Amino acid sequence: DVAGLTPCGESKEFARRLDGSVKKLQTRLSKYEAGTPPALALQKQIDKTKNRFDRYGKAGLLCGTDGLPHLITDGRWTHSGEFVIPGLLFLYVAGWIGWVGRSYVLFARTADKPTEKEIIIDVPVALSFVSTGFIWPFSAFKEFTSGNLIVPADEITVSPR
Amino acid sequence: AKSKAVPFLSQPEALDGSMAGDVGFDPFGISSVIDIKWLRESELKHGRICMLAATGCLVQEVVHLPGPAFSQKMALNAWAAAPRGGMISILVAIGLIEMISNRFALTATDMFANPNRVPGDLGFDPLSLGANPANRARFELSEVIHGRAAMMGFSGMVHQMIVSKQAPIEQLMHFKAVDSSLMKLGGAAGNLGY
Amino acid sequence: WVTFYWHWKHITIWQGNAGQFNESSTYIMGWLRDYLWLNSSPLINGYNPFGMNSLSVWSWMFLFGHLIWATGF
Amino acid sequence: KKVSITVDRDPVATSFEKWAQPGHFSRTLAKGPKTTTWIWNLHADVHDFDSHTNSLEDISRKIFSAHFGQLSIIFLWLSGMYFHGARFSNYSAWLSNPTAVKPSAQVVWPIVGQEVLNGDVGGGFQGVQVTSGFFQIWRSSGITSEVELYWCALAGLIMSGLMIFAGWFHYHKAAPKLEWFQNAESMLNHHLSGLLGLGCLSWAGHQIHVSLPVNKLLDAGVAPQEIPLPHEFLVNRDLMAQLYPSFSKGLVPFFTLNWSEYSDFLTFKGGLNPVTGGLWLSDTAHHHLALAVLFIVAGHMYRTNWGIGHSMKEILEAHKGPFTGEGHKGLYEILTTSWHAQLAINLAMLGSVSIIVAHHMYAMPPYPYIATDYPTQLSIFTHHMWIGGFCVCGGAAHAGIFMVRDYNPAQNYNNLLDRVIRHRDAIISHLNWICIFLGFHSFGLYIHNDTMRALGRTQDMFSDTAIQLKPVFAQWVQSIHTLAPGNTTPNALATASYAFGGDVVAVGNKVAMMPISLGTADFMVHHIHAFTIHVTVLILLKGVLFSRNSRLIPDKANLGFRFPCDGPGRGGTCQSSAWDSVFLGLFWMYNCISVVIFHFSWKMQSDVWGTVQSDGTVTHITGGNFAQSAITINGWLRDFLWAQASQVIQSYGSALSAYGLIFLGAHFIWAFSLMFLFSGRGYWQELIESIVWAHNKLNVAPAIQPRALSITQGRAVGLAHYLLGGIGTTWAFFLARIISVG
Amino acid sequence: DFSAAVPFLKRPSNLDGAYIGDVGFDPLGFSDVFDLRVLREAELKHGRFAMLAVLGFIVQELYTFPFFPKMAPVDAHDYFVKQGGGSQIIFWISFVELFGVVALFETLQGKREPGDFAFDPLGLAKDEATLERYRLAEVKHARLAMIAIGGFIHQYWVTKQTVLEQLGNF
Amino acid sequence: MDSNFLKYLSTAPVLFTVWLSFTASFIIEANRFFPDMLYFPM
Ligand code: CLA
Ligand code: CLA
Ligand code: CLA
Ligand code: CLA
Ligand code: CLA
Ligand code: CLA
Ligand code: CLA
Ligand SMILES: CCCCCCCCCCCCCCCC(=O)OC[C@H](COP(=O)(O)OC[C@@H](O)CO)OC(=O)CCCCCCCCCCCCCCC
Ligand SMILES: CC1=C(C#C/C(C)=C/C=C/C(C)=C/C=C/C=C(C)/C=C/C=C(\C)C#CC2=C(C)C[C@@H](O)CC2(C)C)C(C)(C)C[C@H](O)C1
C-alpha cells in the first residue's frame, strides 16, 4: 500500500502475532480450573487480546514486515486519524490550558498580594477562567490583533550586551 | 435566617427571593462560589434542553418522520438510527445560534458584563406572549419549575431506557420489574477487575 | 547516539539479520540487550580464567575506558 | 522526688489558621514568596525546629509530638501489611506448602495490560511476589489463618489512632516541660527495663505459649486448620504438657530455682531446625527470656528518686587519665542540652545495629522457611545494609550540626572534644594515609590481576592457584567456632551458624546454610570493604572536625552548617561546609554498600545457595565461579554484572517485566542526576532569563520570579537522584535475578 | 463538686447541665478532650438509628411485605446485599448524610442545635414545656435503645431464636 | 465549612495533587471503557 506496507487485516505476520499472543495466554490458562478467579482473569485477557487485534485489522492501519501497525503521518487524508486528528485534539486542549493559565496570571497581577494568589489559588476565579478556554482560538486571536497579547520590545527587560 | 426549603440549615446568601422559584435550596453553598446570574442562566438553559428532550423521546416513539431512519421507537436507539451528517449539522446549528444569541458573550467572565444582560434573557419572544408585565411573573415561575421537573424526568427516562431496553411509553404500557441479576452496581474494585 | 545507530544497523545488516534492528530499535531495552549486552560478549571474553586471545588488548582498553571516565566524576 | 511529671496545659491552640499560612514557622518565610527559592526554602527548613525557635522547651515539645506522628505512620504501615496478607495474599496456601508456593501479597488491577504483573506465584493465586519475609514472620508467630491476620490489622489501626491522638494531645493539650525531657537516668531506666526488658519478656511469653506449640504441631506435619487455637494452649495445661512435658510442673521450678526442669522448651541447641531450616524456636524463647532478665537488671543502674543508683555525670567526670586532660567532663551537659548530639549518637548506633542485623539474619536464619526463600534473604540483607549506611551518614550529619550550632568552647575546655579538635590534623592526615595505603593494596591487587590475566601470566596473579593471600585469621576464627560445641560452649549441641563450618542444611532440596569458605577472593574483597569504610570515615570525620574553622576559612562557624562556599578566593572554597562532607560521604557510603551487597549476592549464589542432588553433592546457582573470577575486575564485570543481568533484560512480557522497566527507569534517573551534579547555578539562571523573556513577550510572566535552584539544592537534588537511580538499578537487578533463579 | 449520677466520681466540668440528659456520667473524660456538640449529635444519631432498628427487628418478625421473601432479620442483610435493595437504602441514607455534614457545620458555627433537624410534621410539640419533656425522653429512649440494640443481635448469635419467640420461649 | 481549612485546600500542593489525580483518574477510566486507542477511529 503506502510505502510498501500491507494492510494489517491481510498481513500474515499480524495474524501470527495474534495467534502467538493467544497461545501464550492459553498455556497459562491450562494450569487452572474452570471457575477459579485466575481462569476468569485469563479468559477476560484472551477476549481483550482478540478484540484488540480484530479492531486493528479493520481500522485501515498498515502493518510492516514485522506484523506491527505503522503510522502514516505525511498529511494524507486516508490516514489523518493517526496523527492529524489526535494532533488537532491536542492543540485544542493545550491552547485551552495555556489561555486559561495566562488569564489567571494576568488576573493575579492586579491583586492585593500578587504572589499570594499563585501559592494560594483563588479557586472560584480560577474556575471562572477554566470555563473560558473552550473558545481560546477566537479569544486569543482577537487578543492578538487588539494589541494585548504581544508586548512591544521596549517594555521587556533584556541583557546589556 | 432559616431557609424555607431546609429549616435546619441557614438561608443561603446571594438568594434574595427576587428570582422566581427561589426557595433557599442551596445546601452545598455553591451560590457563594459561582455568581447567581451564571447559575440561573445555566439552570434555565439546562431545563429548556430537558423540556424539549423529554417531550422529544415520547414524541419520537409516537411520531416518526417518514422513512426507516427516523422509525426507532427507543430514543437511545434513535441516536444511532438517525443520519450522522444531519446530526452533525444540528450540532453546528446549535453552535451558531449560541454564538449569535449571546452576542459573542460566551465566557463566564464576559457574559453579563453589559448591564442590561439578564439571566436567561436572550430576547426570544416572537409572538410576545410575555410582553404584558401582568403575566410576566407567572410565566417566569412556570418556566423555572418546568425546567427542574423536566431535568428530573429526562434523567429518569434515560436511565429507565438503560435498565430495560424499552421505549418510555411501552414501559408504562407493559411494566417489567428489574430482575437486578444483570447490571449490578459497580464492582470493578471488588472482584479485582476483569 | 550517532555511532551506536550506525554500528548497530550495520552489524545487523552484515550478519544478514536486519530484522533484529528493525524490531528491537523502537524501544530502549532493544538497544540495551540486543546491541550493548549481546555484542559485549566477545569483547569481555578477550581474557578469562580459561585463557586469552588477541582481543585481550581491547578487553583491557574497555576496562581502562571505564576507569578514566569514572575518575572524571 | 526531683524526678517528677510537669506539664503545661493547653499550650497551643488547635487551629486551622496556620495551615492556610505556609511558612508560618520562620520569620524569613512567613512574609511570603517573591522568588521561587521561597518554595524550596519552605520545605528545606521545616523540621529544623532549633532554627525557628530559641527555647529548648518548645523544640523538645515539637520533637516529642513528631515522634508520635512517625509512630502513627509506622503502625498504619504494619496494619496495611497485615491487611494485605489477610485479604490479598496466598498465605493460607503457603502454610500448607512453604517450599512450593511463592509468597505474594500484592495484586494489581487490570488497566493498560499491567495485569501481566499478576504472575503465577502458586496456590491457585496470581499476584506480585513479595520478598519482605512477612509470611515467615507470621508462621513464626503462629498465625495459621487469615482471620488472625485481620485481627492484627485492626490492632495496628487502633495503635495508629492512639499514636496520632497522643501526638496531638501532648503538643496541644498537655505538653511536658523541659525539666521532664531532661531526665536521662529515668529515661534510660524505663527504656532498658520497661521498653526493652518487658518487650523481650512479653515476647518470650508469647513464644512459649503460642509460637512453640503451634510451630511444633506445624513441623510435626499437622494441617493448619487442624491445629488448636492459641488460647487452648493457655488454658488446657494437659494439652501443652503433651507437647512439652515440663509444663506438668508449672511455675514451681521457676520460683524454686530448679530451672533445669524447663529444658524441654528453654533449650540451648544452636544450629538450625532440620525441618524448616530456621533457628530452633526453643532457643529463641530462651534467648528472649535471658535478654529480658538482663535488660530489666540493666535498667536499675541509674539514680532517679531514691538514693540508690549511679549519677551518669559522676561516672563520666571520673573517667580521666593522663593523656586526655579533664576527660569526659561536660559530656553530660552536651547530651542533655543538645538534641543533635543525641541524634548523632543514636543514628550511628541504629545504623550499625541494622548492619549487624543484615549479617546475623542471613547467617543464622531465624524464621521457619526463610533460609530457602532466597528472594527474601537477599532482599532483607540488602535492605538492612542500605538502612545501616544511610543512618551512619546521618550520624555524622548531626555531629556536624552539633559542632556548628550547639558547641560552646567555654563549657568544653580541655575535655575530650577540645582535645580532638586540637589534634584534628594528626587524625585526618593519618586517616588519609591509611585510605591511600588501603586503596593501593586492595584495589591495586585487582589491577595487578587484570593485567597479569590479560598478559597471559596466570602464575603471577594473587589467587588460590598462584601467589596466595589467604585469610588465615578469618579461617582460624571459623575453626574455633566449629570446635566450640562441646568444647568452649560445652552445653551447646550445634554451632552458632553453619557458615563457620559443619553440615549442609537442606530444606526442600535447597540449601538453607552451609560453610562459607574464605579464600584469596575473600581476602581481597574484605580489604576492599575496609578501604571503602575507612574512606567514608575520612570524609565524614573531616567534615565534623573542620566544621567550625580551618586553615582555609578561619570563621566557618559563622557561615553555618550548610553554606555553598566562601567565594572563589583563596583559590576557591567550593563545598567547604560540614554539609558538603555529608554530601560527599553519602557517595562513598553508596560505593561501600554497593560492593558489600554485590559480594554477598555473588558469594551466596556461587558458594552457598543451590540444590542438593543425590549423594549429597550441591549444585550452586552460579556454579562456584567466585573463587577464580572475583579476583579480577573483568571477572566482576563479566561473571557477575553481565551474566546475572540476563534476567532483568529478558524479563519483558513476563511477571518480572516491572523489574525490567524499573531497571531502565533507574538507569535514567541516575544519569539525569549528573545534570545537577556536573553543572553550576549560573548557567541555569542565565538560561531561565531567556525563558522569562519569552514569557514577558506574551505577558505571561509569573509573579513568583523563577530562579535556578540554590548551589546547595543543586547538590542535594543531584545526590538524591544519583542514590535513587543507583539503588533502584540494583533493586531491580537483584530482585528479578533472584526471583528467577532462586 | 461531684457528679449526680455517680456520687464518688467528680463532675466532669464540661457537663454543667448545658445539654439535656446530663447526669454527670463521663468517667473516661472524652467531654473535656473533644467538643461536646459533636458527641451530642452523634449520641442522637446513634440512638435514632438504634431506636428504629429495635422496632424494625420486632416488626419484621411480626409482619413482612409479601414480595420480599420472609427471612430472619439478622440474616436478611446478606440477601439484600446481593439483591441490590440494601445498596439502595445505603445510597439514600448517604444522600441525607451529605446534608447532615452541612448541618454539622451549622452546629459548629452556632446556628443549629446538636440534633435539631426541625422535624415536626405532626406538630406533636405544642409548646416549649412539652418539647422539653420530649427531648429528655428522646435522650433516654436513645440511650436505652442503644443498649437494647445488640441486646438480641448478640442473643441471636448465642441462640438462633427470634427475639419475640425467644422472649416467650424458655 | 471553615474558611481557613478551605484556604488550606486552595494551597498550590493540594490543588496540584487533586487536579492531577483527577486528571490521571479520567485518563484511567477512559482507558478502561475504551482501551487500545492507537488512532482516532476514522
Ligand atoms: C500504608 C501502606 C499501604 C500501601 C503502600 C498500600 C498499597 C496499596 N493498596 Mg492497601 N491498604 C492499606 C495500606 C497500604 N496499601 C491499609 C492500612 C488498608 C486497610 C484500610 C489497605 C486496604 C486496601 C484495600 C482494601 C485495597 C488496597 C489496595 C492497594 C493498592 C492500590 C491502592 C490504590 O491505588 O488506591 C487509590 C485510591 C484512591 C482513592 C486514590 C486516592 C489518591 C489521592 C489523591 C491521594 C492523595 C493523598 C492526599 C492528597 C494527602 C493529603 C490530604 C489532604 C487533606 C491535603 C496498593 C498496592 C487495593 C488493591 O490491592 O486492590 C487489588 C485495594 O483494593 N489497600
Ligand atoms: C515503661 C516505660 C516506657 C516505655 C515502654 C517507653 C516507650 C517509648 N518511648 Mg519513652 N519515656 C519513658 C518511659 C517509657 N517509654 C519515660 C519515663 C520518659 C520520661 C523521661 C520517656 C520519654 C520519652 C521521649 C522523650 C521519647 C520517648 C519515646 C519512646 C518510644 C520510642 C520509639 C519506640 O521504640 O517505639 C516503638 C515501640 C513500641 C513498643 C511502640 C509501643 C507504643 C506504646 C506507647 C508502648 C507502651 C504500651 C503499653 C505500656 C503496653 C501495654 C501492655 C499490655 C497489652 C499488657 C517508645 C514508645 C520517643 C518517641 O517515639 O515518642 C513517642 C521519644 O521521643 N520516650
Ligand atoms: C499556563 C502558563 C504558561 C504559559 C502560557 C507558558 C507559555 C510559554 N512557555 Mg512556559 N512555563 C510555565 C507556564 C507557562 N508557560 C511553567 C509553570 C513552567 C515551569 C515548568 C514553564 C517553563 C517553561 C520553559 C522551560 C520554557 C517555557 C516556554 C514557553 C513558551 C512556549 C510554549 C512551551 O514551550 O510550553 C512549555 C511548557 C512547559 C515546559 C511547562 C508547562 C507546565 C504546565 C503544563 C503549564 C503550567 C500550568 C499552570 C499551573 C496553569 C494553571 C492555571 C490555573 C491556576 C487557572 C510560551 C511562552 C519555552 C519558551 O520560552 O519558548 C519560547 C521554554 O523554553 N516555559
Ligand atoms: C412552557 C414553558 C415555558 C415558559 C413558561 C416560558 C416562559 C418564558 N420564556 Mg422560555 N423557553 C421554553 C419554554 C418556556 N418559556 C422553551 C421550551 C425554550 C426553548 C428550548 C425557551 C427558550 C427561551 C429563551 C431563549 C428565552 C425565553 C424567554 C421566556 C420569557 C418570555 C417569553 C414568554 O413569555 O413565553 C411564554 C411562554 C409560554 C406561555 C409557554 C410556551 C408554550 C408555547 C406557547 C407552545 C409550545 C408548544 C410546543 C410545540 C410543545 C409541543 C407539545 C407536545 C405535546 C408535542 C418567559 C418567562 C425569554 C426570557 O425572558 O427569558 C427569561 C428568553 O430570552 N425562553
Ligand atoms: C526505614 C526503615 C525500615 C524499614 C522499612 C524496615 C523494613 C523491614 N524490616 Mg527492618 N530494621 C530497621 C529499619 C527498617 N526495616 C532498622 C533501623 C533496624 C535495626 C533495629 C531493623 C531491624 C530489623 C529486624 C531485626 C527485622 C526487621 C525486619 C523487617 C521487615 C519486616 C517488618 C516488620 O514487621 O518488622 C518485624 C520485626 C520483627 C518481627 C523483629 C524485630 C526485632 C528487633 C530486635 C526489634 C528491636 C526494636 C527496638 C525498639 C529497637 C532498638 C534499637 C537499638 C539500637 C536500641 C521489613 C523488610 C524483620 C525481617 O527481616 O523479617 C523478614 C526482622 O526480623 N528489621
Ligand atoms: C532519625 C533520623 C533523622 C532525623 C530526625 C533527621 C532530622 C533532621 N535532619 Mg538529618 N539525616 C538523617 C536522618 C535524620 N535526620 C540521615 C539518615 C541522613 C543521611 C542522608 C541525614 C542527613 C542530613 C543532612 C545532610 C541535613 C539533615 C538535616 C536535618 C534537619 C532538617 C530536616 C528537614 O527539614 O528536611 C525536610 C525533608 C525533606 C526535604 C525531604 C526530602 C528528602 C528526600 C530527597 C526525599 C526522599 C526520597 C524518597 C524517600 C524516595 C522517593 C521515591 C521516588 C521513586 C519518587 C532535621 C533536624 C538538615 C539540616 O540543616 O539540619 C539542621 C541537613 O542539612 N540531615
Ligand atoms: C574510578 C573512579 C575513582 C577513582 C579511581 C578515585 C580515586 C580516589 N579517590 Mg575519588 N571520587 C570518585 C571516583 C574515584 N576516585 C567519585 C565519583 C567521587 C564523587 C563523590 C569521589 C570523591 C572522592 C573523595 C571525596 C575522596 C576520594 C578519595 C580518593 C582516593 C582514595 C585513596 C586511594 O585509593 O588511593 C589509591 C589510589 C587509587 C586506588 C587510584 C588508582 C591507582 C591504581 C592503583 C593504579 C595506579 C597506577 C600507577 C600510578 C601508574 C603509574 C605510571 C603512569 C603514571 C604512567 C583516590 C585518589 C579520597 C582521598 O583522596 O583521600 C585519600 C577522598 O577523600 N574521592
Ligand atoms: C447534583 C448531582 C446529582 C448526582 C446524583 C448521582 C446519583 C448516582 C450516584 C450513585 C448512585 C448509587 C450507586 C452505587 C454504585 C456502587 O455502589 O458501585 C460499587 C462501586 C465500588 O465497587 P464495590 O467495592 O462496591 O464492589 C462491590 C462488591 O460487593 C462486588 O464486587 O462504588 C463506586 O466506587 C462507584 C463510585 C465511583 C467513584 C468515582 C465517581 C466519579 C468521581 C468524580 C470525582 C468525585 C466527585 C464526587 C464523587 C462522590
Ligand atoms: C420525631 C418526629 C416524628 C417521629 C418519629 C418516630 C419514628 C419515632 C420512633 C420512636 C421509637 C422507635 C422509639 C423506640 C425506642 C425503643 C427503646 C427505648 C428500646 C426498648 C427495648 C428494651 C428496653 C429491651 C429489651 C430486651 C433485649 C435487649 C432482648 C430480649 O430478649 C429481651 C428484652 C425484650 C427485654 C413524627 C414523624 C411522628 C412527627 C413529630 O412531629 C417529630
DSSP string, D596-664: HHHHHHHHHHHHT-EEE-GGG-EEESS-S-HHHHTTSHHHIIIIIIIHHTHHHHT-TTSTTHHHHHHHH
Task: Report in angstroms the alpha-carbon separations of D31 from A115, B113, B187, D180.
Answer: 11, 36, 50, 35
**CB of A119 within 8 Å of any CB in chain F?**
yes
Contact residues of ligand 4, CB 6 A cut-off: B 48, 51-52, 55, 59, 120-125, 129-130, 139-140, 142-143, 146
Which-ligand-closest: CA of D156? 1
DSSP-derived secondary structure for E21-89: T-----SS-HHHHS-HHHHHHHHHHHHHHHHHHHHHHHHHHH---SSSPP--HHHHHHHHHHHSHHHHH
- Ligand 2 contact via D150 beta carbon (within 6 Å): no
Which-ligand-closest: CA of D580? 6
Distance from CA of C39 to the nearest CA of D (A): 11
In angstroms, rounded to a whole number, what is the distance separating the alpha carbons of residues B50 and B150? 5
In angstroms, rounded to a whole number, what is the distance separating the alpha carbons of residues D463 and D623? 18
Q: Nearest 5°: phi and psi at D705?
A: -60, 125
Which subunits count as partners of chain A given 3+ CB pairs below 8 Å?
A: B, C, D, F
In angstroms, rounded to a whole number, what is the distance separating the alpha carbons of residues E32 and E37? 12
In angstroms, rounded to a whole number, what is the distance separating the alpha carbons of residues D284 and D281? 5
Which-ligand-closest: CA of B27? 8
In angstroms, rounded to a whole number, what is the distance separating the alpha carbons of residues D117 and D652? 11
Grid coordinates given for A83: 496523527
Residues of C in contact with A64 (CB under 8 A): 22
In angstroms, rounded to a whole number, what is the distance separating the alpha carbons of residues D360 and D371? 12
Residues of A in contact with F41 (CB under 8 A): 59, 81
Distance B143 CA to ligand 4 centre (A): 7
Closest CA to F40 of D420, A90, D635: A90
Residues of D in contact with C45 (CB under 8 A): 638
For residue B28, give the DSSP letter.
Answer: T
Within 8 A by CB and 6+ apart from D251, the residues are none
**Cβ pair C52:D652 closer than 8 A:** no
DSSP-derived secondary structure for D310-376: B-HHHHHHH---SSSTTTTTTHHHHHTT-HHHHHHHHHHHHHHHHHHHHHHHHHS--STT-SS-HHH
Which one of A63, A66, A70 makes the best mutation probe of the C interface by having the most chain C beta carbons within 10 Å?
A66
**CB of B107 within 8 Å of any CB in chain A?**
yes
Amino acid letter at B151?
M
Query: Which DSSP helix (H) or strand (E) runs through D505?
Result: strand D505-507
Please state, as a whole number, how many other Cβ atoms lie within 10 Å of the Cβ of residue B108: 20
**CB of C23 within 8 Å of any CB in chain A?**
yes
Which-ligand-closest: CA of C67? 7
Strand locations in chain F (E):
none
- Ligand 1 contact via F21 beta carbon (within 6 Å): yes
Q: Looking at ligand 3, which atom is closest to the CA of residue A126?
A: 55
Residues of B in contact with D107 (CB under 8 A): 192
Amino acid letter at D461?
M
Task: Report in angstroms the alpha-carbon separations of C51 from B135, D454, D455, D644.
Answer: 107, 9, 10, 22
Within 8 A by CB and 6+ apart from B173, the residues are none
What angle (nearest 5°) sits at the alpha carbon of residue C70, between those of residues C62 and D436?
Answer: 110
What angle (nearest 5°) sits at the alpha carbon of residue D733, between those of residues D729 and D736?
Answer: 135
Which subunits count as partners of chain F given 3+ CB pairs below 8 Å?
A: A, D
In angstroms, rounded to a whole number, what is the distance separating the alpha carbons of residues E138 and D435? 82
CB under 8 A, 24+ apart: contacts of D682-686: D682/D708, D684/D708, D684/D709
**In chain B, positions 30-89, which contact chain A (CB-CB < 8 Å)?**
33-34
Q: Could you tell me how many residues make up chain D?
A: 742
Three-class DSSP category at B100: helix
Closest CA to D713 of D693, D685, D686, D692: D685
Q: Looking at ligand 4, which atom is closest to the CA of residue B101?
A: 25
Closest CA to D723 of D626, D582, D612: D582
- Ligand 5 contact via D71 beta carbon (within 6 Å): no
The torsion angle over the Cα atoms of residues D499, D502, D503 and D507, rounded to 10 degrees, is: -20
Task: Report in angstroms the alpha-carbon separations of D221 from D91, D95, D206, D228, D597.
Answer: 17, 11, 22, 14, 36
In angstroms, rounded to a whole number, what is the distance separating the alpha carbons of residues D369 and D385? 22
Q: Nearest 5°: phi and psi at D422?
A: -90, 5
Residue that the C-alpha cell 492459641 belongs to: D230
Distance from CA of A129 to the nearest CA of B (A): 7
Question: Which class for B31: exposed (0-12), middle (13-18), buried (19 or more C-beta within 10 A)?
Answer: middle
DSSP-derived secondary structure for D174-218: EEEPHHHH--HHHHHHIIIIIIIIHHHHHHHHHIIIIIHHHHHHH
In angstroms, rounded to a whole number, what is the distance separating the alpha carbons of residues A145 and A148? 8
- Ligand 7 contact via D652 beta carbon (within 6 Å): no
In angstroms, rounded to a whole number, what is the distance separating the alpha carbons of residues D522 and D442? 11
What angle (nearest 5°) sits at the alpha carbon of residue F17, between those of residues F13 and F23?
Answer: 145
For residue D397, give the DSSP letter.
Answer: H
Q: Nearest 5°: phi and psi at B60?
A: -60, -40
Three-class DSSP category at B10: strand
In angstroms, rounded to a whole number, what is the distance separating the alpha carbons of residues D289 and D206? 11
Grid coordinates given for D12: 497551643
Distance from CA of A4 to the nearest CA of B (A): 34
**Numbered residues of chain E with Cβ closer than 8 Å to any chain B Cβ:** 83-84, 87, 99, 102-103, 106, 111-112, 116-118
In angstroms, rounded to a whole number, what is the distance separating the alpha carbons of residues D376 and F24? 34
Is D562 annotated to bind a ligand? Reply is yes
Q: Looking at ligand 6, which atom is closest to the CA of residue D47?
A: 34
Three-class DSSP category at D106: strand
CB under 8 A, 24+ apart: contacts of D45-49: none
Is residue A65 within 8 A of residue A13, CB to CB? The reply is: yes
Is residue F39 within 8 A of residue A81, CB to CB? The reply is: yes
**Numbered residues of chain A with Cβ closer than 8 Å to any chain B Cβ:** 37, 40-41, 44-45, 103, 123-124, 127-129, 131-132, 134-135, 139
Nearest residue (CA) to ligand 1, atom 2? D77
Grid coordinates given for D243: 507437647
Is residue A119 within 8 A of residue D39, CB to CB? The reply is: yes
In angstroms, rounded to a whole number, what is the distance separating the alpha carbons of residues B54 and B60? 10
- CA D105 from centre of chain: 23
For residue D302, give the DSSP letter.
Answer: B
Grid coordinates given for B77: 436507539
Closest CA to E139 of E13, E33, E47: E47
- Rg value, chain B, Cα: 21
**In chain F, positions 2-41, which contact chain D (CB-CB < 8 Å)?**
2, 4-5, 7-8, 11, 28, 31-32, 35
Nearest residue (CA) to ligand 2, atom 40? D71
- Ligand 3 contact via D700 beta carbon (within 6 Å): yes
Closest CA to D380 of D398, D363, D393, D396: D363
Within 8 A by CB and 6+ apart from D725, the residues are D666, D667, D668, D669, D670, D671, D672, D673
For residue B2, give the DSSP letter.
Answer: B
Please state, as a whole number, how many other Cβ atoms lie within 10 Å of the Cβ of residue E87: 15
C-alpha neighbours within 13 Å on the C-beta side of residue D542: 22
Residue that the C-alpha cell 544478514 belongs to: C16
Considering only the beta carbons, identify the residue of C29, C37, C60 that sits closest to D450. C60
Q: What is the maximum span of chain B, computed from C-alpha positions, in angstroms?
A: 63
Is residue D648 within 8 A of residue D730, CB to CB? The reply is: no
Grid coordinates given for A135: 473558545
Q: Per residue in E13-51, is it b (16+ CB within 10 Å) or e — as a string?
A: ebbeeebebbebebeeeebeeeebbebbbebbeebbebb
What angle (nearest 5°) sits at the alpha carbon of residue B42, between those of residues B41 and B46?
Answer: 120
Grid coordinates given for D373: 526463600
Residues of D in contact with F2 (CB under 8 A): 16
**Left (φ > 0), alpha (ψ -120 to 50) or beta: where does D146 sit?**
alpha
Report the relative pairing of strands A62-63 and A6-7 from DSSP bridges: antiparallel
Distance D557 CA to ligand 7 centre (A): 30
Amino acid letter at D575?
Q
In angstroms, rounded to a whole number, what is the distance separating the alpha carbons of residues E95 and D546? 66
Task: Report in angstroms the alpha-carbon separations of A21 from A17, A25, A28, A62, F38.
Answer: 6, 7, 11, 19, 18
Closest CA to D500 of D648, D359, D614: D359
Composition of chain F by helix, strand, coil, percent to 5? 70, 0, 30
Please state, as a whole number, how many other Cβ atoms lie within 10 Å of the Cβ of residue D627: 19
For residue A6, give the DSSP letter.
Answer: E
Residues of D in contact with B193 (CB under 8 A): 109-111, 115
In angstroms, rounded to a whole number, what is the distance separating the alpha carbons of residues D157 and D137? 19
What angle (nearest 5°) sits at the alpha carbon of residue D550, between those of residues D549 and D554?
Answer: 60
Residues of E in contact with B24 (CB under 8 A): none
Chains B and A physically touch (3 or more Cβ atom pairs below 8 Å) = yes
Distance E18 CA to ligand 9 centre (A): 25
In angstroms, rounded to a whole number, what is the distance separating the alpha carbons of residues C9 and E62? 85
Is residue D302 within 8 A of residue D188, CB to CB? The reply is: yes
Q: Which residues pair with D489 in a beta bridge?
A: D485
Nearest residue (CA) to ligand 6, atom 24? D397
In angstroms, rounded to a whole number, what is the distance separating the alpha carbons of residues D274 and D368? 10
Q: Which residues pair with D513 in a beta bridge?
A: D505
Q: How was this structure determined?
A: cryo-EM
For residue D103, give the DSSP letter.
Answer: P
Testing ligand 6's pocket by substitution, the residue of D47, D590, D712, D721 carrying the most ligand atoms inside 8 A of its CB is: D47
**Cβ pair E99:B29 closer than 8 A:** no
Torsional sign, CA A111, A113, A115, A118? negative
Amino acid letter at D115?
E
Which-ligand-closest: CA of D83? 1
In angstroms, rounded to a whole number, what is the distance separating the alpha carbons of residues D635 and D487? 41
Resolution in A: 3.3
Distance D547 CA to ligand 7 centre (A): 24
Three-class DSSP category at D120: strand
Is residue D581 within 8 A of residue D535, CB to CB? The reply is: no
In chain D, the N- to C-terminal Cα span, in Å, equals 60
Within 8 A by CB and 6+ apart from D140, the residues are D211, D215, D278, D281, D366, D367, D368
Q: Looking at ligand 8, which atom is closest to the CA of residue B191?
A: 31
Chains C and B physically touch (3 or more Cβ atom pairs below 8 Å) = no
Chains B and D physically touch (3 or more Cβ atom pairs below 8 Å) = yes
Is residue D173 within 8 A of residue D2, CB to CB? The reply is: no
- CA A4 from centre of chain: 28
Within 8 A by CB and 6+ apart from D587, the residues are D719, D722
Closest CA to F42 of A92, A69, A60, A57: A60
Is residue D90 within 8 A of residue D127, CB to CB? The reply is: yes
Closest CA to D98 of D273, D218, D271, D211: D218
- Ligand 1 contact via D107 beta carbon (within 6 Å): yes
Is D684 annotated to bind a ligand? Reply is yes
Report the relative pairing of strands D119-120 and D104-106 from DSSP bridges: unpaired
